[PDB]
Amino acid sequence: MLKIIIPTTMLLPMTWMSKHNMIWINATVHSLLISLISLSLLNQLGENSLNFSLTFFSDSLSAPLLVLTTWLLPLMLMASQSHLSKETTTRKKLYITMLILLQLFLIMTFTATELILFYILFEATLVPTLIIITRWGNQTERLNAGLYFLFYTLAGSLPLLVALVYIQNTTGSLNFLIIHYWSHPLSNSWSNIFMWLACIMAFMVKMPLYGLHLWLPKAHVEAPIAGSMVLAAVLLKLGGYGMMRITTILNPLTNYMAYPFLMLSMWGMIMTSSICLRQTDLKSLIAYSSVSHMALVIVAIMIQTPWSFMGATALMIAHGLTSSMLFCLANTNYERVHSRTMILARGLQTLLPLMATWWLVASLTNLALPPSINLIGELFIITASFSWSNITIILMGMNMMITALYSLYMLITTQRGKYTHHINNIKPSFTRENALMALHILPLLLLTLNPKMILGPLY
Amino acid sequence: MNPFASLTLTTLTILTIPIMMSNSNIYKTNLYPNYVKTTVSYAFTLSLVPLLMFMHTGQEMIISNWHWMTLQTVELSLSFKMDYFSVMFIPVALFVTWSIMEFSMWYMHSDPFINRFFKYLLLFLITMMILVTANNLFQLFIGWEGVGIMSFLLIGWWHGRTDANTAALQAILYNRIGDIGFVLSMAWFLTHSNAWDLQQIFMLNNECPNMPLIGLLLAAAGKSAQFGLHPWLPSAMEGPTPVSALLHSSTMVVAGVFLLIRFYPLMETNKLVQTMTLCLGAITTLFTALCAITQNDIKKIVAFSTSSQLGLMMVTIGINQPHLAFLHICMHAFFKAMLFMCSGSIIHSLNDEQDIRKMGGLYKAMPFTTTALIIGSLALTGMPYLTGFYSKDLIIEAVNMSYTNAWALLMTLIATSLTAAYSTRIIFFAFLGKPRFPPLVLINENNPLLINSIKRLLIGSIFAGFIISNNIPPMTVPNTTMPLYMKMTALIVTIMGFMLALELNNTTYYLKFKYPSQTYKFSNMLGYYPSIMHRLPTYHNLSMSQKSASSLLDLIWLETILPKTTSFIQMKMSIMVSNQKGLIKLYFLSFLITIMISMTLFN
Amino acid sequence: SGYTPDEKLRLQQLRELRRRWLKDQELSPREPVLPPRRVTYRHSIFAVTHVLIPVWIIHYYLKYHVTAKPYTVVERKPRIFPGDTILETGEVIPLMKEFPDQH
Amino acid sequence: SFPKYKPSRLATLPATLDPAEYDISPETRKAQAERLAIRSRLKREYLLQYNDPNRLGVIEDPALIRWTYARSANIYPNFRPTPKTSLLGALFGIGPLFFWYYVFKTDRDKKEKLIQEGKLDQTFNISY
Amino acid sequence: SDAPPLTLEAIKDRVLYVLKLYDKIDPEKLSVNSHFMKDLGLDSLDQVEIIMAMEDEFGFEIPDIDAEKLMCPQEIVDYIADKKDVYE
Amino acid sequence: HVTKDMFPGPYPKTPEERAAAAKKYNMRVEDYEPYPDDGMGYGDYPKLPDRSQQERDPWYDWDHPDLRLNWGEPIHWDLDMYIRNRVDTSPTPVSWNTMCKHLFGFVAFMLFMFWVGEIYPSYQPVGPKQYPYNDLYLERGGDPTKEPEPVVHYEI
Amino acid sequence: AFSAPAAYLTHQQKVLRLYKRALRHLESWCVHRDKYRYFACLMRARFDEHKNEKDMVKATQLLRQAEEEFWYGQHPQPYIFPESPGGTSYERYECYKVPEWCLDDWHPSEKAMYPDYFAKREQWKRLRRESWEREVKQLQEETPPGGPRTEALPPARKEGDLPPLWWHIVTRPRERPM
Ligand SMILES: CCCCCCCC/C=C\CCCCCCCC(=O)O[C@H](COC(=O)CCCCCCC/C=C/CCCCCCCC)COP(=O)(O)OCCN
Ligand SMILES: CCCCCCCCCCCC(=O)SCCNC(=O)CCNC(=O)[C@H](O)C(C)(C)COP(=O)(O)O
Structure with missing residues (x-):
């Protein structure tokens, strides 16, 4: 596992010793090389895991997330290359350093043999993204967004530290292998109920759960493109990964403690989707769609069945890729219009046809069209919920319907109709943006050919 | 071995070659439409052979060629079912598509x-293929979403526009x-x-419950x-x-009836679901015929005719006659398709004019x-010894000789009368x-592409x-003996509709x-x-999406x-704690108080 | 009613300008300067490259790979009628019960 | 005399059938004149900014900015806890949750009772 | 489409042709520059009916605000030419 | 380029600030009408007529022909609800109540008549169909080691 | 469309519009031409009876009952021309209309094709550049104080002067560009 961590750490001296006009080239090249190296982790076993050492290990659940995290950084660099043109070399190096540190923290977070180390790195990731949002942010509300994003997560995660140290003092270890092998049932007690709440709330606040999702539209609107990319693709999956790992010790309490949350998601995935129908901002619309998808993932995790787990993993990967693509598209529009409103730039398919094709493919992926992995995860979770209770389908069906609607809404308002007359600074699309979209979309349709790589360890 | x-796989394989060539140089020239049309014609003439083999013997096969994945005890693989329905519907669909593309090479000449x-x-x-x-529900869903x-x-x-x-x-x-319902x-x-x-699914379900068939019926209705x-x-x-003629008139729409046909072994074991299917078909066909009776746009009229035909096919499904419904599909x-082609030819000849009020005497022009329109309308209305005869007449016969709803029977009879009526309306007013243009x-038809495309479907x-009808093997118990009045009821209602419609359209000449x-x-x-269904519900949703969904809950109370609350509490507590004048008098008074409290409380 | 004089002059001048602009919209014979640079017969080549090659590949794939595994390609049992003969075994189906034939 | 047309929220009264347009006073003419005057001033300023060859950007529309700000960020500072808002929020945010909870709890309890009683016929139910 | 590119001469010829089919106005008195209310003594309803006939002849309908101030044949031809973008 | 003072503010209470808000929104003081002063944060923004965007004049030379809006004019709070691709409130030849009554009556009568036809069905003067080998017991389901009760069919 | 609107609608204009719309809907009702002509002359006969009415009160009371009666008998599916705001091809070609300014972004390799057109385009650009500078001054000196009272534009009055605000009216894409 060190063969991935060490080059990521070496990315920092490379960036700081690079020429004043070559930082982007070397950063992108070596990030892509690190992604190629990390591709080896996909080789998994039907047995326990690949236990590299006493400190790190990999699984069929950590492997897709690690590969996605390593693949993200070149895309973030290409996205951030444009709007940082008038920046001093030292500050560009600081920005690249923040991105590299965030990737390193996520890489060592997703392996994490021991729960306290996982918590340490999972809380360490809060700093680079907070600095990115509050420093390289366009609007004056970036400070409030940073405060919200920091304090929601810290309030959720502070009881988790107490719960984890209490676990280590009682059972004796926090190593995940020993935790799984020496697992014992949880008695129905008030102490155990608060134990469950402390262990669960920290991850459920970052998914985000409906009603605890107020921070996400703010942190998405006020962040730069790289911040929105990283927080929509991987940083949302930290909560899902945490719940998937930690639920092994919460049984059989979860059978009846999950009821308040399931409802909050089952209704919430509807409500936010309806919110997407009436939105004047592209970024807010995509943020609310992300909230809906992550609510469905929460339902899948709380159901706690094999099909639920595989569907949740596939949905996490697919949602990350699609959300990053959509935010790239929105940022490309913003860099031309500088407005970030839906109704100003209209009829863009007349002006940018290939970008219209990219919009169509992104919307179709978000619409969960077969045989894309989005639909694979969605269908697996829907079937598992149907087995959980035959009535759930109703809500599920409604959400699916509404989903398609708003997706096509986002496709029709921005690309069809009559172009706005007074916007004439719509330059033809660069090769950089088109390459970014192609590198976003081709992995999705390639993963569609081999779903077993993203179906988790329960495949 | 076993061609x-x-x-059967080669037809589908070669249907996809121009899609791969869409990035080649031929896509940037004007020869691409002819290339695609030739590919479709070759696919049709190639697909004609397995149908012949089935006609000779009755060959049926499942081909599970590629194994996609395995999920515990479930196995998902790329499987094609090539039974009678598939090997019969493929040649018809390819023929119709070939005619439509040849027509479109003329209709859409000016489109950049x-x-x-x-x-x-x-x-x-x-x-659609x-x-x-498709042999499993996942592949069928893939096609279901692709056509949509x-x-x-x-x-x-x-x-x-x-x-x-908004229509899309x-x-x-x-x-x-x-x-x-499909999901x-x-x-x-x-x-x-x-x-x-x-x-x-066929093996394990001898008495299919209501829920899966309800879902299938909902999907087919949708x-x-x-x-x-x-x-x-x-x-x-x-x-x-061209799109309306092929996608919405004869191919994509029949997807629901085809899905119900695919699961006909399970449908026959449920008596309630068949009743719902029959009732839904009857209401669909009558409502659509009633609408088509007074419509003035030719395309809308033929669309309502297609909807009525689909309702009639669903009625056939309800009375447990799936093969008859498939024949009516064919x-x-x-x-x-021919009716839509003739209509589009008229619109192209009248400078993109669709209303029938501004088109008059074209019979000689x-x-x-x-x-072609006359022959198509005769076949549609059940003229004997024509294409529409062998299906529609048997539908009428079977619905009239079965233990079914009396209201449904009356409904399909009135629907047939109204079909004759609106066909007469089209002919009379067109x-x-x-002339009224x-x-x-x-006006000009002298284009070999249009003439050939029309005449192929006309033959x-x-x-x-x-x-x-003479080549397929028998698939149902025939109705050999009929009462004489019930035997001709289809023709009787046909001529009744013809006469009544003609009399009603004759009065428009009166100066009244x-x-x-x-x-x-x-x-x-x-x-x-x-x-109402496009004003009342949508509004009552969208308003909530703005009022309850975003403002009241998300923007107001969840923030409150x-x-x-935390921010307000912390600010108030900070104000209370820090608001000191800096006097050591009160400080040492509090020191004394806390000293006495500690002495008297913790011991 | 009618136009005010200012309206008539403005409409006239705008219309002359529009006609001039529209006349400028035409193309001279040499206008598309294309720069050139390079590096039954049609029906026969079509039937070869668009039918024969795909059917060859499909036949090979089905004959030697798809059929290599069990139950991948499975066939409906051919119908058996009385009086028939079987190539594999050679026995003959005995006839039926000589039903009473009339009309 | 002919049957009256009753307008509704979703089907408004035609402009030709409004009695208000027939009640003509010099005040109404003055109001219409100043309405068209402000419309003409806005159109003049928009066209002046639009036809200028020097501009190569997006004409900032204050109305659009005001609409977006009012839709997004002007809700809470103008929000006051009232019995109407409190009651509507409580209903729309708590009622559906408890209603779905009751529905699903009843369904799952019935299913569990049937499972314990053994009368469910879960044959071939392998994947869950 | 296959629509021939009609010209100003064609449009003026059609307008004068339909105007000559109007019995209320004399074929000899009418000119390309002849006014309806004054040079021909017509009514406002006559003008709106003439606009109706032009709309029916040419297949497109003129909006009322534009048609009410279309008082002479030459400006009718000019309006139609501007609307249909015909060169010469 | 937008200053702090032209952004929407709180509900106007005195006529002076009412006229100031009307001037800010580019509309007449007499035409200006804010939303009621309830908890919902409509605030300063004007209560425009609930008319849809479809029924606006199609011949006016709007700056935005597709949306039929003019630059600088006040925007309806629910503009995204009426964009000609969504719910519209254009007048209809028949009144709303009459259309609702007619459709509801048609559907209710249809359902009632279908139920009645279910109660009173239609058939033919025939007996039940006869199948040879004990209503085809062996080929329908099977169970060959049970010897079901034989059923013989009546020849007439 | 081309004509600037007025602050209000006169009674004569309103009655003309009622006549136009009623005649069109009657034509829609009576499909055949001869029947249409018969009922149209009848409609004109019942229309001009109150032509010579004098007082405003009765005239305003009229044209109101007429509007209500028309509303009751309006033929809920009238005939609409294909390019009309309700026709079958109202906005069919709006997707082929492309602004002129996009030609400013063409690659020089593409600009190599069609050289005469682009030379004329630069000529038009220079003409617009001078005429705009003239037009700003002409419009500010021409406008009444306190803001314009109507959206009507004055024409050009000098020799080399061009009509104010002409660029985006003259350079419309086309009616049917492709
Ligand atoms: C978005 C903000 C969310 C913030 C987190 C919300 C969840 C809060 C979790 C509860 C807080 C305390 C957790 C304690 C850590 C777990 C350790 C544990 O469970 O051990 C228990 C100890 O359990 C406790 O002591 C817990 C007491 C709670 C004290 C603090 C109360 C905080 C507020 C509680 C209500 C809110 C919780 C849910 C909030 C939902 C989010 C809004 C047993 O200890 P013993 O005494 O040795 O065993 C007895 C037998 N000899
Ligand atoms: C199926 C549809 C049914 C619709 C039927 C509607 C009912 C039709 C009957 C309406 C009766 C009336 O006119 S209501 C009568 C209202 N009062 C007047 O008309 C008095 C003055 N008339 C004018 O001024 C006119 O414009 C005029 C002088 C005619 C033209 O003038 P020009 O041209 O010189 O400009």
């Missing part, structure tokens, strides 16, 4: 993006409403039968535009004529279109009167019904003006179904509870 499998149009037509054809030949998304892309062909966009979104909406059926089948493969979800099919006329393909006459609508009756108004606005 059946090789040829004609290669994209042909590319889209071919993509829709591929997705995938849907038809291709219809969305083709309806909104002119994206600069608001009405095209409406079609997507209704098809997703059907998709809810419910898929979940039920995999939960209970533990497989999506058709063979296991995609076939039944009474509950009808308006999308007539509103889908915003697209080009015949309706031919004559409905454009004879080939007139005779070919018989005096602008003085500048641009089809004359002979294919007889050929297919009377305001329209209440019943007539109801028929013109489509029972007011499009109005956690963040704002």
Whole structure:
């Protein structure tokens, strides 16, 4: 596992010793090389895991997330290359350093043999993204967004530290292998109920759960493109990964403690989707769609069945890729219009046809069209919920319907109709943006050919 | 070995070559439409062979070639079913598509993006073939979604028009409403039968419960535009004529009836679901015929005719006659496609004019279109020894001789009468009167592409019904003996509708003006179904999406509870704690108080 | 009614300008300067490259790979009628019960 | 005399049938004149900014900015806890949750009782 | 489409042709520059009916605000030419 | 370029600030009408007529022909609800109540008549169909080791 | 469309519009031409009876009952021309309309094709550049104080002067560009 961590750490001296006009080239090249190296982790076993050492290990659940995290950084660099043109070399190096540190923290977070180390790195990731949002942010509300994003997560995660140290003092270890092998049932007690709440709330606040999702539209609107990319693709999956790992010790309490949350998601995935129908901002619309998808993932995790787990993993990967693509598209529009409103730039398919094709493919992926992995995860979770209770389908069906609607809404308002007359600074699309979209979309349709790589360890 | 499998897969394989060549140089020239049309014709003539082999022997095969994945005890693999339905529907669909593309090479000559149009037509054809030949529910769902998304892309062909966009979104909406039931059926089948493969579903379900068949019926109603979800099919006329002629008249729409046919062994074991199917078909056909009676746009009239035919096919499904419904699918393909082609030829000849009020005497000005439309209307109305005879007459016979609803029987009889009536309306108002178009006459059919495309389907609508009926093996117990009055009831209601419609249209020459009756108004606005059902629910959703969803809950109360209360409490406590004047008097007084409290309290 | 004089002059001048602009919209014979640079017969080549090659590949794939595994390609049992003969075994189906034939 | 047309929220009264347009006073003419005057001033300023060859950007529309700000960020500072808002929020945010909870709890309890009683016929139910 | 590119001469010829079919106005008195109310003594309803006939002849309908101030044949031809973008 | 003072503010209470808000929104003081002063944060923004965007004049030379809006004019709070691709409030030839009554009556009568036809069905003067080998017991389900009760069919 | 609107609608204009709309809907009702002509002359006969009415009160009371009666008998599916705001091809070609300014972004390789057109385009650009500078001054000196009272534009009055605000009216894409 060190063969991935060490080059990521070496990315920092490379960036700081690079020429004043070559930082982007070397950063992108070596990030892509690190992604190629990390591709080896996909080789998994039907047995326990690949236990590299006493400190790190990999699984069929950590492997897709690690590969996605390593693949993200070149895309973030290409996205951030444009709007940082008038920046001093030292500050560009600081920005690249923040991105590299965030990737390193996520890489060592997703392996994490021991729960306290996982918590340490999972809380360490809060700093680079907070600095990115509050420093390289366009609007004056970036400070409030940073405060919200920091304090929601810290309030959720502070009881988790107490719960984890209490676990280590009682059972004796926090190593995940020993935790799984020496697992014992949880008695129905008030102490155990608060134990469950402390262990669960920290991850459920970052998914985000409906009603605890107020921070996400703010942190998405006020962040730069790289911040929105990283927080929509991987940083949302930290909560899902945490719940998937930690639920092994919460049984059989979860059978009846999950009821308040399931409802909050089952209704919430509807409500936010309806919110997407009436939105004047592209970024807010995509943020609310992300909230809906992550609510469905929460339902899948709380159901706690094999099909639920595989569907949740596939949905996490697919949602990350699609959300990053959509935010790239929105940022490309913003860099031309500088407005970030839906109704100003209209009829863009007349002006940018290939970008219209990219919009169509992104919307179709978000619409969960077969045989894309989005639909694979969605269908697996829907079937598992149907087995959980035959009535759930109703809500599920409604959400699916509404989903398609708003997706096509986002496709029709921005690309069809009559172009706005007074916007004439719509330059033809660069090769950089088109390459970014192609590198976003081709992995999705390639993963569609081999779903077993993203179906988790329960495949 | 066994050329059946090789040829059946080769047709689908070669149907996809121009899609791969879409990035090659031929896509940037004007020869691409001819290339795609030639590919389609070759595919049809190649597919003609497995049908012949089945006709000789009765060959059926399943081909599970590629193994996609395995999920514990479930196995998902790329499997094609090539039974009678597939090997019969493929040649008909390919023939209809070939005629439609040859027609479109003339109709869409002035469109700058004609290669994209042909590319889209071919993509829709591929997705339809995938849907038809599918052996498991996942592949069938893939085709189900592909045809729908291709219809969305083709309806909104002119994206600069608001009405095209809203019509495409409406079609997507209704098809997703059907998709809810489709997904419910898929979940039920995999939960209970533990497989999506058709063979296991057939084995493990001897007495199919209500829920999976309810889901299948909902999906079929959504995609076939039944009474509950009808308006999308007539509103889908915003697209080009070639698209409407093939996608919405004879191929994509029959997807729901085909799905119900695929699961006919399970449908016959449920008596309630068959009753619901019959009732839904009857209401669909009568409502659509009533609407088509008074419509004035030719395309809308033929769309309502197609909806009525689909309702009649669902009625056939209800009385447990699936093979008859498939035969009616095959015949309706031919004559409905020809009717749409003739209509589009008239519109192109009259400078993009669709209303029948501004088109008069074309009977002599454009004879080939007139005779083709006359033959198509005769076949549609059940003229004996024609293509529509062998299906529709047997439908009427079987519905009249079965233990079914009396209301449904009356409903289909009235629907047949109204079908004759609106066919007469089309002919009378489009070919018989005096001309009513602008003085500048641009009428011309002298184009070999259009003539050949029309005449191929015209020969089809004359002979294919007889050929297919005489070639397929028997599939149902025939009705040999009939009471004489019940035997001719189809012809009787046909001529009754003809005579009554002709008498009613003859009175328009009278110099009498009377305001329209209440019943007539109801028929013109489509029972007011499009109005209220497109104004009341949508509004009552969207307003909530702004009021309860975003402002009240997300922007007001969820912000009030956690963040704002905490901030207010902390600010107030900070103000109380820090607000000291800096006097050591009060400081040491508090020191003394806390000293005495500690002394007297913790010991 | 009618136009005010200012309206007539403005409409006239705008219309002359529009006609001039529209006349400028035409193309000279040499206008598309294309720069050139390079590096039954049609029906026969079509039938070869668009039918024969795909069917060859499909036949090979089905004959030697798909059929290599069990139950991938499975066939409906051919119908057996009385009086028939079987190539594999050679026995003959005995006839039926000589039903009473009339009309 | 003919049957009256009753307008509704979703089907408004035609402009030709409004009695208000027939009640003509010099005040109404003055109001219409100043309405068209402000419309003409806005159109003049928009066209002046639009036809200028020097501009190569997006004409900032204060109305659009005001609409977006009012839709997004002007809700809470103008929000006051009232019995109407409190009651509507409580209903729309708590009622559906408890209603779905009751529905699903009843369904799952019935299913569990049937499972314990053994009368469910869970044959072939392998994947869950 | 296959629509021939009609010209100003064609449009003027059509307008004068339809005007000559109007019996209320004399064929000899009418000119390309002849006014309706004053040079021909017509009514406002006559003008609106003439606009109706032009709309029916040419297949497109003129909006009422534009048609009410269309008082002479030459400006009718000019309006139609501007609307249909015909060169010469 | 937008200053702090032209952004929407709180509900106007005195006529002076009412006229100031009307001037800010580019509309007449007499035409200006804010939303009621309830908890919902409509605030300063004007209560425009609930008329849809479809029924606006199609011949006016709007700056935005597709949306039929003019630059600088006040925007309806629910503009995204009426964009001609969504719910519209254009007048209809028949009144709303009459259309609702007619459709509801038609559907209710249809359902009632279908139920009645279910109660009173239609059939033919024939007896039940006869199948040879004990209503085809062996080929329908099977169970060959049970010897079911034989059923013989009546020849007439 | 081309004509600037007025602050209000006169009674004469309103009655003309009622006549136009009623005649069109009657034509829609009576499909055949001869029947249409018969009922149209009848309609004109019942229309001009109150032509010579004098007082405003009765005239305003009229044209109101007429509007209500028309509303009751309005033929809920009238005939609409294909390019009309309700026709079958209202906005068919709006997707082929492309602004002129996009030609400023063409690659020089593409600009190599069609050289005469682009030379004329630069000529038009220079003409617009001078005429705009003239037009700003002409419009500010011409406008009444306190803001314009109507959206009507004055024409050009000098020799080399061009009509104010002419660029985006003259350079419309086309009616049917492709
Ligand atoms: C978005 C903000 C969310 C913030 C987190 C919300 C969840 C809060 C979790 C509860 C807080 C305390 C957790 C304690 C850590 C777990 C350790 C544990 O469970 O051990 C228990 C100890 O359990 C406790 O002591 C817990 C007491 C709670 C004290 C603090 C109360 C905080 C507020 C509680 C209500 C809110 C919780 C849910 C909030 C939902 C989010 C809004 C047993 O200890 P013993 O005494 O040795 O065993 C007895 C037998 N000899
Ligand atoms: C099926 C549809 C049914 C609709 C029927 C509607 C009912 C029709 C009957 C309406 C009766 C009336 O006119 S209501 C009568 C209202 N009062 C007047 O008309 C008095 C003055 N008339 C004018 O001024 C006119 O414009 C005029 C002088 C005619 C023209 O003038 P020009 O041209 O010189 O400009």
